[PDB]
Amino acid sequence: DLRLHLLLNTSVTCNDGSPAGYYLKESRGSRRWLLFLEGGWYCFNRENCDSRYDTMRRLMSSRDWPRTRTGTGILSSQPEENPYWWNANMVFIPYCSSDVWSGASSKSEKNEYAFMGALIIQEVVRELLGRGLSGAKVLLLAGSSAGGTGVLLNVDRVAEQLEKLGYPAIQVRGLADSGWFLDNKQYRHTDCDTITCAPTEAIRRGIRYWNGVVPERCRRQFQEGEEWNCFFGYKVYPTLRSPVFVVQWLFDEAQLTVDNVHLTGQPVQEGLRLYIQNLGRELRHTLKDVPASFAPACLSHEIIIRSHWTDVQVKGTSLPRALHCWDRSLHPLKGCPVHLVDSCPWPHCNPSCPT
């Protein structure tokens, strides 16, 4: 069980002005720290943020959070569930800023909501240094779905923060799970309300609404008004200096959702078949030069904090093994691969996919 700590700096808030926070379980004999970012879509204007506040409030406020939370998957402390990092210090940072962990804007008399995701990460790191993070050797910033994209947007800033506070010996790394999207053509198409708004347009509006921030090198390449590009992994990843391991289903359920694909009634005709085969090929292509990656040919969404994350294999190697091999490479390894991308072209052509 990880136990809740609300941030001591009460100016760093969730959407509704309530204090943000984190769940922590220490491991006194370890110098490894795992900070995990929760996901859960986003909202980009007053009307659709108000809708989210009615029926997804724990993603916008801490007033109802529980005092503890069970560590699952990579946040588990039992070697059987977590062969990778079971003895690490474990941190779960709830997502209550609806801004893909990018915002830096306070609630005020001209802002109904606060969007402080980027500042929430920075403040969690600050306060953890007084609880043991000052003695760490490796800080792994992990995340799933919107939290996976948030890793890509924040890993280099965390590294810069620790360097300027005087801790250059801590190695900062990233683990981005299910946050690697494509700004591709949709299967069927509409004009930008909430759902008809393609991600590129919804993110462009989000950024102005949240006062979003993106990594510096990427910001300098794309420049004013085009920062939305840095929310797409294959565009921001080449600009990053910290080592980042990428986990991505080739047929991600959230990617199909934004593409207006619904697999139902099961009779796939030629146009949809070619669309789905082309999406898998495109995702494979963006990963060819990512040396640390795990990309199975499955229709699913998220993996690393799920209890049975040990079951899926690519070319005979599990995800927890691939992550251990990555640890060893950061000291090519015989029988310990780090780049694992399926080549078969249809969902579930890998027999180990989640059912």
Ligand SMILES: COc1cc(-c2ccccc2)nc(N)n1
């Ligand atoms: C779970 O919902 C989402 C949506 C998006 C996203 C949408 C448009 C552009 C870039 C990213 N990203 C993540 N990581 N999660």
Ligand SMILES: *[C@@H]1O[C@H](CO)[C@@H](O)[C@H](O)[C@H]1NC(C)=O
């Ligand atoms: C509290 O957080 C705000 C916003 O990030 C920051 O401006 C301020 O310096 C912080 N105060 C302390 C004491 O860390």
